[PDB]
Design a protein around this ligand. Structure first.
Ligand code: CL
Ligand code: NA
Length: 289
């Protein structure tokens, strides 16, 4: 299902799925179209169509198609041109923030609505990984272990992921895990995103590029954004601090900020009160369609 689209800004890979008002779905760091499709499932179910990119440096999209957040925004607009598309909704999460914010800021005519989930909204510095976590997230061996865990010990993987992505107590992690193991969509989402967190191999170029670029952000100029905007933050997110979302909402006039109490970085998909937020996101992204 991956298609290469030749744009005026270079080649970009994407997966085109669903039917309805279109939404550009922008993965985090690391990520790729696997993460993006997992992010997009609720949209397809709500009767929207998703355009799920591989950002430059991930899988088949060459880094040269856009290194900076601003160049990645330029690529997305060039992708819309290559699809004959005037404008689309935008759904971003985490490291998908900067390029999505730039698209909304500098190409406002191309963005119908913005849903920004725990998104990097200003300069950000990655804390490296040490010891076992480093091997697990940084190597092909680590990648294979995550794949085996997802296939064969899914509850253990879900637990590890919820703990890594939040500041929750042991007891609250276990409560979240039991919820997820009772909802097949939540389980599937979590397992897919856990595997995509490993930045080795074909995710390495894009991941290293994102870490370098996010550390160099001057301003993304979110105050320029005029799209109707929903910003979503889990209060226990240990990956992208809630302050990034409060900042973003304060910059974007008319934006709405939704907090998910005791939510991890995955809250918008896995928090027990997230269903209404996804429904609201979908309605916003339909943008009168
Ligand atoms: Cl959560
Ligand atoms: Na934790």
């Amino acid at each position: 299902s991956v298609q290469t689209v030749s744009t005026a800004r270079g080649e970009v890979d994407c997966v085109i799925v669903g039917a309805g008002p279109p939404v550009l779905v922008v993965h985090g760091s690391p990520g790729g179209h696997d993460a993006g499709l997992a992010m997009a499932r609720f949209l397809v179910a709500e009767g929207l169509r998703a355009i799920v990119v591989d950002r430059p440096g991930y899988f088949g999209t060459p880094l040269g198609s856009g290194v900076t957040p601003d160049e990645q925004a330029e690529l997305y607009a060039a992708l819309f041109d290559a699809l004959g598309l005037a404008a689309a909704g935008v759904l971003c999460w985490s490291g998908g923030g900067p390029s999505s914010y730039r698209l909304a800021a500098r190409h406002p005519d191309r963005v119908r609505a913005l849903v920004s989930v725990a998104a990097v909204s200003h300069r950000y510095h990655f804390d490296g990984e040490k010891g076992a976590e480093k091997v697990l997230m940084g190597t092909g061996l680590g990648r294979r272990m995550l794949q085996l865990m997802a296939a064969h010990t899914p509850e253990k993987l879900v637990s590890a992921t919820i703990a890594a992505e939040g500041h929750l107590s042991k007891e609250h992690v276990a409560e979240r895990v039991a919820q997820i193991m009772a909802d097949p969509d939540k389980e599937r989402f979590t397992l897919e995103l856990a595997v995509s967190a490993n930045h080795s191999g074909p995710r390495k170029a894009g991941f290293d590029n994102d870490m370098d670029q996010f550390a160099r952000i001057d301003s993304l100029e979110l105050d320029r954004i005029t799209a109707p905007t929903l910003v979503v933050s889990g209060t226990a997110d240990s990956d992208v601090d809630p302050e990034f979302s409060r900042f973003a909402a304060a910059q974007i006039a008319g934006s709405e900020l939704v907090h998910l109490d005791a939510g991890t970085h995955l809250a918008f998909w896995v928090h027990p009160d997230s269903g209404p937020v996804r429904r609201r996101a979908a309605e916003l992204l339909r943008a009168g369609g």
